[PDB]
Ligand binder design. Structure first.
Ligand SMILES: CC(C)(O)c1cnc(N2C[C@@]3(CCC[C@](C)(Cn4cnc5ccc(C#N)cc54)C3)OC2=O)cn1
Lengths: 561, 112, 135
């Protein structure tokens, strides 16, 4: 009532007079819904600094973990996850003064390094509650900096950002794959002017000469060369799809990706393209050079037979290499869903089918003389289809691939479904009227299909039982097929360009980044260290005077203000 | 000029990729000439325009597969035509329509 | 440090006391990266009018050309091209008062008509640094 309940001091007096104050002051709730919550949580949540002081002065536990079903992340059946701790609670409700009191007080101090059941520290929690809304970001970033500086000053040896949860992530890594721009960019671009805790910055100013300031960012965690679960791999593979295109635009990530593209990305991608086209030319030559007369295996005695065998074995080697490199990639990465198939997930399917078809065709080639010839044709068709994969290297060609994929998937099946609905309806309409076969359905479907294209012959009007009705039905057929063609046209002309044209550049950016990272992960560990972006700058003396020696990355700017 | 240069060669490259793939697929299946590539190329090209005759279905070694492949040829060529339409018809008018006046101004000045 | 270093007048006094102040006050850098730069360039770039005054009053050359690889246009492997001259330097870093002092001073006046190695005068330089940004 009005911020003051007069019964608290007398209740505390009764608590110590009865001799069992300790069991009373911190009594956890027993229900599964609010399990573990203590009076300290209520005092902090109600925003009563003097009440939390008076409650902790008598021995309130400042480490009690509120782990009920209500205090769970929204994705796990709950309404508020604040880090499962009184200090994390005061931190996640924008209460700097209560946090200052909790961290330093004469009675009992709650250290910032304690982890909850999930392993989340205070900073993991402060990331978890962060939104991309600005009114959230102002206090999330500010108080993240406050807590980090306080933990540094109190404990100089440890780094609060360096403690991981049960998932192995760190606050920056956790913000990377949850999609929290406001704190992600603030963590990357932070710099500490105070010399006392300047060592925990991630953007240093190297040198300046007039209007040329060359500040250099720290990528100790962004680019680990496959050693410490780099933030970039998390951000490109496991991050939130809807916000990934914006996370990949932060200041030291776009330039880092461009650097990795120019350093080893362009040459490796292009030699891969050339090798793929050469292998496919060899595959086509082997397909054509195969003699159609004779039951395999063929006697390899002529030199022409030797080159045929060489082409066959190189095709099988390419197929097995494709299988090996596709199964591993699917094994390493999560199975995608909607809005991520058009990025990269689609091509693992197609190359998988290509390898499977080639291998099964080799199996039939072992025994079946007539059988194996069926899916060499499908193999070449599907492979020359997949040749469209490598257009992602060039932006102009990469966007057009997105055009083709989206047109083939989003609207093609919709139009095909409605079109087939009209086919079945009108075929059942026409054929049931005729007076006599089961096979007549097959002929009529192709006849109408040719009529839509214009190569259909109307000589069947004579055999119609009712000539008048079929003329009208065919006119409606033509008109409505034209109407559906116009519908597909109109969707593709307005609604596609409204959304897809803008989204195409964003999808190409993600495709380019994921191909860069795949090319990197192809290399062995020692080779990746050789192509490590950035310098080995020494930033300053540590707390013991030792140099930092952190692999930073410099980008220089021109500022006239 | 922009239609002839920027997108025409892109369409020609993709369409050439498709023709070489499907021609190598179809012709390698036939059971017997080197010159058969030229006849097949023009016949499929007419089929895309609509003046192609489908009388070779009898001579196919596997009749079933070639019907499916021809259907795919037609469908994806239609998809490519739709894609070129959509690209030049949203994205080009987004850029070129504004750029056309600016380029004409430079042409006029340089001719003066 | 905080805009003032106390060792400068002492070093200058040592410079005349050893008898070779002229070689000291304007000593060009020898590396290809910063070739030609003198203490006057540093004084002007750091935006110390008092230091540039006390440095030129003792006999600093106001026409020394900083032509190292760092002081080259961005297109030819460099980060800052300011006209290769102390006056062009004070002009290209928005220092009107230092330019006013450099043009008119009792000791040694730098005329606006002098050209650098490229031939660029002060105005060519002021064009070279200009961007289309309003600031
Ligand atoms: C000719 C030859 C032997 O060099 C070759 C090798 N691989 C393929 N592809 C490419 C691909 C396509 C689907 C995405 C994959 C899985 C991503 N991905 C996973 N690891 C990578 C390493 C480098 C690159 C690049 N550039 C992409 C990578 C790769 O599936 C295949 O079969 C085609 N030809």
């Amino acid at each position: 009532s009005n911020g003051r309940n007069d019964t608290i001091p007398v209740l505390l007096d009764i608590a110590e007079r009865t001799g069992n104050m300790r069991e009373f002051i911190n009594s956890p709730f027993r229900d599964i819904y609010y399990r573990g919550q203590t009076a300290l949580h209520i005092a902090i949540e109600r925003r009563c600094k003097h009440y939390v002081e008076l409650l902790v002065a008598q021995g309130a536990d400042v480490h009690a973990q509120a782990r009920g079903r209500f205090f769970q992340p929204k994705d796990e059946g709950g309404y508020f996850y604040f880090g499962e701790l009184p200090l994390s609670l005061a931190a996640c409700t924008n209460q700097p003064h209560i946090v200052n009191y909790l961290t330093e007080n004469p009675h009992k101090k709650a250290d910032m390094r304690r982890q909850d059941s999930r392993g989340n520290t205070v900073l993991h929690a402060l990331v978890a509650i962060a939104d991309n809304t600005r009114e959230n970001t102002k206090f999330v970033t500010k108080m993240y900096d406050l807590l980090l500086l306080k933990c540094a000053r109190l404990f100089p040896d440890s780094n609060l950002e360096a403690v991981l949860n049960n998932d192995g992530l760190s606050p920056l890594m956790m913000a990377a794959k949850t999609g929290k721009i406001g704190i992600f960019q603030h963590i990357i671009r932070r710099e500490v002017t105070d010399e006392d805790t300047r060592h925990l910055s991630r953007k240093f100013k190297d040198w300046a000469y007039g209007p040329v300031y060359s500040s250099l960012y720290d990528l100790s965690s962004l680019d680990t060369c496959g050693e410490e679960a780099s933030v970039l791999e998390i951000l490109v593979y496991n991050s939130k799809i809807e916000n990934r295109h914006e996370m990949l635009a932060v200041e030291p990530i776009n330039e880092l990706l461009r650097d990795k593209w120019r350093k080893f990305g362009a040459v490796s991608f292009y030699i891969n393209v050339v090798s793929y086209l050469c292998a496919m030319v060899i595959f086509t030559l082997t397909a054509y050079y195969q003699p159609l007369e004779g039951t395999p295996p063929y006697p390899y005695r002529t030199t022409v037979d030797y080159l045929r065998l060489a082409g066959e074995v190189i095709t099988l080697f390419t197929g097995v290499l494709f299988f090996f490199t596709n199964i591993k990639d699917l094994f390493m990465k999560k199975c995608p869903g909607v809005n991520s198939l058009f990025i990269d997930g689609s091509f693992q399917l197609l190359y998988f089918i290509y390898s499977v078809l080639v291998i099964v065709s080799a199996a039939l080639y072992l025994a079946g003389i007539e059988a194996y010839l069926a899916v060499m044709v499908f193999a070449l068709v599907l492979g020359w289809m997949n040749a469209l994969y490598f257009t992602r290297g060039l932006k102009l060609t990469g966007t057009y691939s997105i055009m083709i994929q989206k047109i083939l998937f989003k609207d093609l099946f919709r139009f095909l479904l409605v079109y087939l609905l009209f086919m079945i309806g009108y075929a059942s309409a026409l054929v049931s009227l005729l007076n006599p076969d089961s096979e007549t359905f097959s002929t009529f479907l192709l006849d109408l299909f040719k009529l839509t294209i214009g190569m259909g012959d109307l000589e069947m009007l004579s055999s119609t039982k009712y000539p008048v009705v079929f003329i009208i039905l065919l006119v409606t057929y033509i008109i409505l097929t034209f109407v559906l063609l116009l519908n597909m046209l109109i969707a593709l002309m307005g609604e596609t360009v409204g959304q897809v044209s803008k989204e195409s550049k964003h999808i190409w950016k993600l495709q380019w980044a994921t191909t860069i990272l795949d090319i990197e992960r192809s290399f062995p560990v020692f080779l990746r260290k050789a192509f490590r972006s950035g310098e080995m700058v020494t930033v300053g003396k540590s707390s013991d005077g030792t140099p930092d020696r952190r692999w930073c990355f410099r980008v220089d700017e021109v500022n006239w203000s």
